[PDB]
Amino acid sequence: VLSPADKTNVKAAWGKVGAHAGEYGAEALERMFLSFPTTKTYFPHFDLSHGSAQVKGHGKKVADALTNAVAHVDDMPNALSALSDLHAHKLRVDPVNFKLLSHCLLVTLAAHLPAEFTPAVHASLDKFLASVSTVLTSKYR
Amino acid sequence: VLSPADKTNVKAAWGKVGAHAGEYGAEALERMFLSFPTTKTYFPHFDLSHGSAQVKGHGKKVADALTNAVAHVDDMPNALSALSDLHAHKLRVDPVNFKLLSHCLLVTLAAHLPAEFTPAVHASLDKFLASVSTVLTSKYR
Amino acid sequence: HLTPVEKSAVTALWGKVNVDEVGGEALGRLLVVYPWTQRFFESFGDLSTPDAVMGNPKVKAHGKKVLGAFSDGLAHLDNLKGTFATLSELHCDKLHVDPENFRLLGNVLVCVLAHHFGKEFTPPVQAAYQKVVAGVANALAHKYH
Amino acid sequence: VHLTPVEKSAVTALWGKVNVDEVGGEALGRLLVVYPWTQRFFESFGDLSTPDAVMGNPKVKAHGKKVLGAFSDGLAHLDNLKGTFATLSELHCDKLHVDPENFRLLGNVLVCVLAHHFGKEFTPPVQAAYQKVVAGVANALAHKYH
Ligand code: HEM
Ligand code: HEM
Ligand code: HEM
Ligand code: HEM
């Protein structure tokens, strides 16, 4: 549940990603795969290598996805319906993995957006990412 | 996020609780205090002896709040906003304690309403109480 | 861990458990209530529905094995670390099951005990069992510590 | 925990640039802001009503420095983190009753603070190494519970 403030924070913080959506997305992944290798078990069809255009391009959609999740923040279950099916029904992603990706995304934001990663914004982003994580791991069709 | 079958499961199951709501609240409360003694530190002014009158009055309030969440299962944040203020702002309950109490609520239902506690109803009730717990531990005012 | 009156409580109740049924119901309910665990069982076939899951013969057979594990934990509450030392290796080092799932299974078994024994599963009996299942999940996760 | 010699080198170079009188307080303040129920353990600390109050709170800054000092003790004793934190564990699990999920949280907040301070220098390899460290510390701090 985000306060009105939380949504302005994520709106404001996540907007500054901008063209770098791809880049931050890919790095967050790279961060997760190196820091938490078990998460590779979900991507055996990917090229794990650093700089791998499959990782790089996948990151672009997660960021858009999240941009879209920021875009339908108060409609997120309807808006993330397809990704729920993918992640909860089809892939069966264990929910801890969302906490790992969520942390790597925060690390990336902290590393690339220091002026915007204030404590208030950090807390809003964590709740936002937890909210996206709850939607993606729940079967509600 | 509760599915449509989730919502009808919860509502039909709660109906069968009926007049025993307060009784099951107090038992879940006792189970929790005995099974997880650290939770008692949230009730230092409560006489926590077996058969305690404070635990029984309090079980009724909890049951009534859950019954109200069932009635308002589509607008839970709004309908529980005073209880989130209490639990998230003033009490600052660790979310782990909501999992302990939800688990004890399920144990109580499984003990008193075995016909209703199907696997599917179990799944639906679990998400519902996880949902309530998310509202009550979020600061969104 | 268990005081005398506790051990005798859990002992007595565990005597009445159907060892060809409750193990299977706990596993099946794990797979239903916490569906992402299904991922660990694409070998087991039909897990599409609650009724499909709860009747899967391998789900039942496997559940017998886990209740067997629990039976073995109850036997040696002295040193479940060593008791489950081999299982911990399989669950942690080999299959990489997040240990929160260990806690979830124990709580489901506890539910399933309450579901079967009803009023006999008193708050004090649950409390002793909660110590037991936490010991099994801990011991099971020893290779993570 | 076992870091590769290059992880150890990268970890120690970054750490040597850590502001030992601030980072500890940033990490604790963020814990209390991002995970507001942890404030329950610090009602002795005074004003926590707002994020700026949390971060500016002298008691927070104070207590954060000693926490940073333990993470330092941990870094110097990576092969024996249980021993190093044996008494600390007694304090956090037996006396305080802190649910050990929160130890993972602080460790991950610290990583976010290291990222904040070091930017690009806090590369994914470097992060990978520190995740190893803070996982180590949290569990040695949780050891009693094992
Ligand atoms: C915030 C968390 C996440 C978001 C927003 C997210 C978003 C997305 C998006 C947008 C897609 C592709 C949609 C499309 O087909 O156009 C996708 C695919 C995928 N996501 Fe996620 N995801 C998240 C977390 C995870 C996690 C934690 C995992 C696994 C550990 C995961 C695994 C996948 C996989 C395996 C795919 C499919 C890859 C492919 O074959 O293209 N995702 N995700
Ligand atoms: C879904 C779970 C819960 C529900 C529905 C719930 C509901 C309530 C309700 C209705 C009240 C009293 C409201 C009032 O008097 O104005 C209350 C108070 C309280 N709750 Fe909860 N609660 C839940 C979980 C928890 C948990 C897990 C804890 C702690 C372990 C907790 C601790 C308290 C405390 C300390 C009070 C105030 C007691 C008093 O002074 O009378 N609650 N809760
Ligand atoms: C928590 C208490 C648990 C106990 C006591 C337990 C015990 C066992 C036992 C006795 C086996 C049989 C070894 C064999 O197949 O030869 C086993 C296998 C397995 N367990 Fe567990 N287990 C537990 C929890 C879990 C959890 C949480 C998961 C994952 C969600 C899991 C997944 C498996 C899998 C996938 C296998 C092997 C499957 C196969 O043989 O095809 N277990 N476990
Ligand atoms: C995860 C790594 C953690 C480390 C390294 C750590 C470290 C320490 C240290 C070094 C002390 C000081 C002991 C002394 O003064 O003699 C301490 C005290 C304390 N820690 Fe932690 N801690 C950790 C986690 C936590 C968490 C998660 C909480 C609460 C959520 C917590 C709450 C406290 C409190 C309340 C005190 C002392 C209270 C007081 O003196 O006023 N700590 N910690």
PDB file of N, CA, C and O in Angstrom, chain B residues 29-44 48 91-101 104, chain C residues 127 130-131, chain D residues 40-41 91-100 102 145:
ATOM      1  N   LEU B  29      -5.312 -16.029  19.620  1.00  0.00           N
ATOM      2  CA  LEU B  29      -4.490 -15.182  20.479  1.00  0.00           C
ATOM      3  C   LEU B  29      -3.714 -15.994  21.523  1.00  0.00           C
ATOM      4  O   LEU B  29      -2.539 -15.726  21.772  1.00  0.00           O
ATOM      5  N   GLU B  30      -4.371 -16.981  22.129  1.00  0.00           N
ATOM      6  CA  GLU B  30      -3.731 -17.810  23.144  1.00  0.00           C
ATOM      7  C   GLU B  30      -2.685 -18.714  22.516  1.00  0.00           C
ATOM      8  O   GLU B  30      -1.559 -18.830  23.017  1.00  0.00           O
ATOM      9  N   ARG B  31      -3.066 -19.397  21.436  1.00  0.00           N
ATOM     10  CA  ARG B  31      -2.116 -20.191  20.664  1.00  0.00           C
ATOM     11  C   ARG B  31      -0.863 -19.394  20.352  1.00  0.00           C
ATOM     12  O   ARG B  31       0.262 -19.881  20.522  1.00  0.00           O
ATOM     13  N   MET B  32      -1.042 -18.159  19.872  1.00  0.00           N
ATOM     14  CA  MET B  32       0.111 -17.334  19.523  1.00  0.00           C
ATOM     15  C   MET B  32       0.992 -17.052  20.741  1.00  0.00           C
ATOM     16  O   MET B  32       2.220 -17.224  20.680  1.00  0.00           O
ATOM     17  N   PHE B  33       0.386 -16.633  21.870  1.00  0.00           N
ATOM     18  CA  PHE B  33       1.182 -16.303  23.051  1.00  0.00           C
ATOM     19  C   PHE B  33       1.908 -17.518  23.613  1.00  0.00           C
ATOM     20  O   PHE B  33       2.976 -17.375  24.216  1.00  0.00           O
ATOM     21  N   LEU B  34       1.321 -18.708  23.481  1.00  0.00           N
ATOM     22  CA  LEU B  34       1.956 -19.906  24.017  1.00  0.00           C
ATOM     23  C   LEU B  34       2.994 -20.422  23.047  1.00  0.00           C
ATOM     24  O   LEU B  34       4.089 -20.834  23.451  1.00  0.00           O
ATOM     25  N   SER B  35       2.660 -20.392  21.751  1.00  0.00           N
ATOM     26  CA  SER B  35       3.565 -20.953  20.763  1.00  0.00           C
ATOM     27  C   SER B  35       4.736 -20.025  20.474  1.00  0.00           C
ATOM     28  O   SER B  35       5.828 -20.512  20.180  1.00  0.00           O
ATOM     29  N   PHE B  36       4.545 -18.701  20.575  1.00  0.00           N
ATOM     30  CA  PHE B  36       5.552 -17.710  20.174  1.00  0.00           C
ATOM     31  C   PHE B  36       5.702 -16.641  21.252  1.00  0.00           C
ATOM     32  O   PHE B  36       5.271 -15.493  21.077  1.00  0.00           O
ATOM     33  N   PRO B  37       6.365 -16.968  22.359  1.00  0.00           N
ATOM     34  CA  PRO B  37       6.271 -16.104  23.550  1.00  0.00           C
ATOM     35  C   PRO B  37       6.785 -14.693  23.348  1.00  0.00           C
ATOM     36  O   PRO B  37       6.439 -13.806  24.146  1.00  0.00           O
ATOM     37  N   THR B  38       7.630 -14.453  22.340  1.00  0.00           N
ATOM     38  CA  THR B  38       8.099 -13.094  22.106  1.00  0.00           C
ATOM     39  C   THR B  38       6.948 -12.141  21.783  1.00  0.00           C
ATOM     40  O   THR B  38       7.007 -10.959  22.149  1.00  0.00           O
ATOM     41  N   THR B  39       5.887 -12.633  21.125  1.00  0.00           N
ATOM     42  CA  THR B  39       4.733 -11.781  20.843  1.00  0.00           C
ATOM     43  C   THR B  39       4.100 -11.203  22.098  1.00  0.00           C
ATOM     44  O   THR B  39       3.409 -10.183  22.006  1.00  0.00           O
ATOM     45  N   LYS B  40       4.306 -11.825  23.261  1.00  0.00           N
ATOM     46  CA  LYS B  40       3.694 -11.307  24.477  1.00  0.00           C
ATOM     47  C   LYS B  40       4.221  -9.927  24.818  1.00  0.00           C
ATOM     48  O   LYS B  40       3.543  -9.168  25.529  1.00  0.00           O
ATOM     49  N   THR B  41       5.419  -9.584  24.336  1.00  0.00           N
ATOM     50  CA  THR B  41       5.996  -8.298  24.690  1.00  0.00           C
ATOM     51  C   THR B  41       5.201  -7.134  24.110  1.00  0.00           C
ATOM     52  O   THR B  41       5.342  -6.011  24.593  1.00  0.00           O
ATOM     53  N   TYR B  42       4.327  -7.379  23.135  1.00  0.00           N
ATOM     54  CA  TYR B  42       3.416  -6.337  22.673  1.00  0.00           C
ATOM     55  C   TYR B  42       2.225  -6.105  23.608  1.00  0.00           C
ATOM     56  O   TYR B  42       1.520  -5.106  23.437  1.00  0.00           O
ATOM     57  N   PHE B  43       1.991  -6.961  24.603  1.00  0.00           N
ATOM     58  CA  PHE B  43       0.832  -6.831  25.495  1.00  0.00           C
ATOM     59  C   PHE B  43       1.257  -6.792  26.965  1.00  0.00           C
ATOM     60  O   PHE B  43       0.763  -7.567  27.795  1.00  0.00           O
ATOM     61  N   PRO B  44       2.138  -5.859  27.342  1.00  0.00           N
ATOM     62  CA  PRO B  44       2.660  -5.875  28.720  1.00  0.00           C
ATOM     63  C   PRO B  44       1.633  -5.483  29.762  1.00  0.00           C
ATOM     64  O   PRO B  44       1.845  -5.743  30.962  1.00  0.00           O
ATOM     65  N   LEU B  48      -2.270 -12.192  30.802  1.00  0.00           N
ATOM     66  CA  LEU B  48      -2.191 -13.209  29.788  1.00  0.00           C
ATOM     67  C   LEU B  48      -2.371 -14.617  30.263  1.00  0.00           C
ATOM     68  O   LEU B  48      -1.973 -15.542  29.580  1.00  0.00           O
ATOM     69  N   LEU B  91       2.096   1.349  17.336  1.00  0.00           N
ATOM     70  CA  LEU B  91       2.647   0.115  17.870  1.00  0.00           C
ATOM     71  C   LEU B  91       3.936  -0.295  17.164  1.00  0.00           C
ATOM     72  O   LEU B  91       4.830  -0.862  17.799  1.00  0.00           O
ATOM     73  N   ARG B  92       4.041  -0.074  15.849  1.00  0.00           N
ATOM     74  CA  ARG B  92       5.231  -0.491  15.115  1.00  0.00           C
ATOM     75  C   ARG B  92       5.488  -1.990  15.312  1.00  0.00           C
ATOM     76  O   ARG B  92       6.566  -2.420  15.722  1.00  0.00           O
ATOM     77  N   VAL B  93       4.469  -2.797  15.018  1.00  0.00           N
ATOM     78  CA  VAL B  93       4.599  -4.236  15.156  1.00  0.00           C
ATOM     79  C   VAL B  93       5.505  -4.788  14.058  1.00  0.00           C
ATOM     80  O   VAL B  93       5.329  -4.498  12.867  1.00  0.00           O
ATOM     81  N   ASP B  94       6.441  -5.628  14.434  1.00  0.00           N
ATOM     82  CA  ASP B  94       7.256  -6.294  13.418  1.00  0.00           C
ATOM     83  C   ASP B  94       6.389  -7.190  12.514  1.00  0.00           C
ATOM     84  O   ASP B  94       5.662  -8.075  13.012  1.00  0.00           O
ATOM     85  N   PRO B  95       6.424  -7.007  11.187  1.00  0.00           N
ATOM     86  CA  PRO B  95       5.610  -7.884  10.304  1.00  0.00           C
ATOM     87  C   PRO B  95       5.711  -9.380  10.587  1.00  0.00           C
ATOM     88  O   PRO B  95       4.744 -10.113  10.300  1.00  0.00           O
ATOM     89  N   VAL B  96       6.838  -9.871  11.107  1.00  0.00           N
ATOM     90  CA  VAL B  96       6.905 -11.297  11.429  1.00  0.00           C
ATOM     91  C   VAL B  96       5.761 -11.689  12.365  1.00  0.00           C
ATOM     92  O   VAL B  96       5.232 -12.805  12.290  1.00  0.00           O
ATOM     93  N   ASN B  97       5.331 -10.779  13.234  1.00  0.00           N
ATOM     94  CA  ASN B  97       4.290 -11.153  14.190  1.00  0.00           C
ATOM     95  C   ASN B  97       2.944 -11.366  13.499  1.00  0.00           C
ATOM     96  O   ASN B  97       2.158 -12.207  13.915  1.00  0.00           O
ATOM     97  N   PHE B  98       2.684 -10.655  12.420  1.00  0.00           N
ATOM     98  CA  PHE B  98       1.471 -10.913  11.656  1.00  0.00           C
ATOM     99  C   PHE B  98       1.491 -12.298  11.029  1.00  0.00           C
ATOM    100  O   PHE B  98       0.449 -12.961  10.946  1.00  0.00           O
ATOM    101  N   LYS B  99       2.658 -12.774  10.585  1.00  0.00           N
ATOM    102  CA  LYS B  99       2.692 -14.151  10.105  1.00  0.00           C
ATOM    103  C   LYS B  99       2.425 -15.139  11.236  1.00  0.00           C
ATOM    104  O   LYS B  99       1.739 -16.155  11.039  1.00  0.00           O
ATOM    105  N   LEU B 100       2.978 -14.890  12.422  1.00  0.00           N
ATOM    106  CA  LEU B 100       2.701 -15.808  13.527  1.00  0.00           C
ATOM    107  C   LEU B 100       1.204 -15.869  13.806  1.00  0.00           C
ATOM    108  O   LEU B 100       0.609 -16.957  13.872  1.00  0.00           O
ATOM    109  N   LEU B 101       0.561 -14.704  13.928  1.00  0.00           N
ATOM    110  CA  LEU B 101      -0.867 -14.684  14.247  1.00  0.00           C
ATOM    111  C   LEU B 101      -1.732 -15.222  13.107  1.00  0.00           C
ATOM    112  O   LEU B 101      -2.711 -15.941  13.358  1.00  0.00           O
ATOM    113  N   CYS B 104      -1.606 -18.877  13.459  1.00  0.00           N
ATOM    114  CA  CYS B 104      -2.448 -19.379  14.538  1.00  0.00           C
ATOM    115  C   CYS B 104      -3.936 -19.243  14.200  1.00  0.00           C
ATOM    116  O   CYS B 104      -4.742 -20.068  14.636  1.00  0.00           O
TER     117      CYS B 104
ATOM    118  N   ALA C 127       2.052 -25.649  20.836  1.00  0.00           N
ATOM    119  CA  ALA C 127       3.263 -24.945  21.234  1.00  0.00           C
ATOM    120  C   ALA C 127       4.458 -25.890  21.259  1.00  0.00           C
ATOM    121  O   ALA C 127       5.552 -25.549  20.790  1.00  0.00           O
ATOM    122  N   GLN C 130       5.402 -26.631  17.677  1.00  0.00           N
ATOM    123  CA  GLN C 130       6.089 -25.503  17.049  1.00  0.00           C
ATOM    124  C   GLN C 130       7.574 -25.524  17.356  1.00  0.00           C
ATOM    125  O   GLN C 130       8.403 -25.155  16.511  1.00  0.00           O
ATOM    126  N   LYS C 131       7.933 -25.931  18.572  1.00  0.00           N
ATOM    127  CA  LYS C 131       9.341 -26.120  18.879  1.00  0.00           C
ATOM    128  C   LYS C 131       9.937 -27.230  18.021  1.00  0.00           C
ATOM    129  O   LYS C 131      11.071 -27.114  17.537  1.00  0.00           O
TER     130      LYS C 131
ATOM    131  N   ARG D  40      11.035   0.338  17.083  1.00  0.00           N
ATOM    132  CA  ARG D  40      10.509  -0.196  18.333  1.00  0.00           C
ATOM    133  C   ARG D  40      11.648  -0.506  19.298  1.00  0.00           C
ATOM    134  O   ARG D  40      11.503  -0.365  20.513  1.00  0.00           O
ATOM    135  N   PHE D  41      12.781  -0.928  18.748  1.00  0.00           N
ATOM    136  CA  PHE D  41      13.949  -1.254  19.550  1.00  0.00           C
ATOM    137  C   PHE D  41      14.711  -0.026  20.031  1.00  0.00           C
ATOM    138  O   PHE D  41      15.593  -0.171  20.887  1.00  0.00           O
ATOM    139  N   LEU D  91      23.394 -11.099  22.761  1.00  0.00           N
ATOM    140  CA  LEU D  91      22.708  -9.830  23.003  1.00  0.00           C
ATOM    141  C   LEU D  91      21.481  -9.558  22.121  1.00  0.00           C
ATOM    142  O   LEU D  91      20.475  -9.036  22.601  1.00  0.00           O
ATOM    143  N   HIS D  92      21.563  -9.908  20.840  1.00  0.00           N
ATOM    144  CA  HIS D  92      20.463  -9.658  19.903  1.00  0.00           C
ATOM    145  C   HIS D  92      19.375 -10.741  19.805  1.00  0.00           C
ATOM    146  O   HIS D  92      18.252 -10.449  19.393  1.00  0.00           O
ATOM    147  N   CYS D  93      19.696 -11.978  20.174  1.00  0.00           N
ATOM    148  CA  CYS D  93      18.732 -13.071  20.087  1.00  0.00           C
ATOM    149  C   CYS D  93      18.158 -13.463  21.440  1.00  0.00           C
ATOM    150  O   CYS D  93      16.950 -13.697  21.543  1.00  0.00           O
ATOM    151  N   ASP D  94      18.991 -13.506  22.479  1.00  0.00           N
ATOM    152  CA  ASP D  94      18.523 -13.867  23.810  1.00  0.00           C
ATOM    153  C   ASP D  94      17.978 -12.663  24.581  1.00  0.00           C
ATOM    154  O   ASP D  94      16.889 -12.735  25.158  1.00  0.00           O
ATOM    155  N   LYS D  95      18.697 -11.540  24.578  1.00  0.00           N
ATOM    156  CA  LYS D  95      18.266 -10.392  25.368  1.00  0.00           C
ATOM    157  C   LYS D  95      17.237  -9.526  24.643  1.00  0.00           C
ATOM    158  O   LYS D  95      16.179  -9.222  25.205  1.00  0.00           O
ATOM    159  N   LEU D  96      17.558  -9.082  23.432  1.00  0.00           N
ATOM    160  CA  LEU D  96      16.671  -8.179  22.691  1.00  0.00           C
ATOM    161  C   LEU D  96      15.502  -8.812  21.937  1.00  0.00           C
ATOM    162  O   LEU D  96      14.477  -8.166  21.723  1.00  0.00           O
ATOM    163  N   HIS D  97      15.654 -10.067  21.537  1.00  0.00           N
ATOM    164  CA  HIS D  97      14.601 -10.758  20.772  1.00  0.00           C
ATOM    165  C   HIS D  97      14.320 -10.086  19.424  1.00  0.00           C
ATOM    166  O   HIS D  97      13.168  -9.920  19.010  1.00  0.00           O
ATOM    167  N   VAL D  98      15.383  -9.712  18.728  1.00  0.00           N
ATOM    168  CA  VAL D  98      15.267  -9.152  17.387  1.00  0.00           C
ATOM    169  C   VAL D  98      15.038 -10.292  16.402  1.00  0.00           C
ATOM    170  O   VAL D  98      15.834 -11.239  16.331  1.00  0.00           O
ATOM    171  N   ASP D  99      13.952 -10.218  15.633  1.00  0.00           N
ATOM    172  CA  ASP D  99      13.735 -11.272  14.662  1.00  0.00           C
ATOM    173  C   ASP D  99      14.869 -11.247  13.643  1.00  0.00           C
ATOM    174  O   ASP D  99      15.161 -10.188  13.065  1.00  0.00           O
ATOM    175  N   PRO D 100      15.525 -12.376  13.387  1.00  0.00           N
ATOM    176  CA  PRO D 100      16.776 -12.337  12.608  1.00  0.00           C
ATOM    177  C   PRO D 100      16.590 -11.940  11.143  1.00  0.00           C
ATOM    178  O   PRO D 100      17.591 -11.642  10.483  1.00  0.00           O
ATOM    179  N   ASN D 102      15.575  -9.110  10.388  1.00  0.00           N
ATOM    180  CA  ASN D 102      16.066  -7.727  10.412  1.00  0.00           C
ATOM    181  C   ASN D 102      17.582  -7.612  10.286  1.00  0.00           C
ATOM    182  O   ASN D 102      18.074  -6.522   9.973  1.00  0.00           O
ATOM    183  N   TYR D 145      20.258 -18.576  17.380  1.00  0.00           N
ATOM    184  CA  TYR D 145      19.044 -19.202  16.866  1.00  0.00           C
ATOM    185  C   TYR D 145      19.241 -20.493  16.078  1.00  0.00           C
ATOM    186  O   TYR D 145      18.276 -21.164  15.778  1.00  0.00           O
TER     187      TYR D 145
END
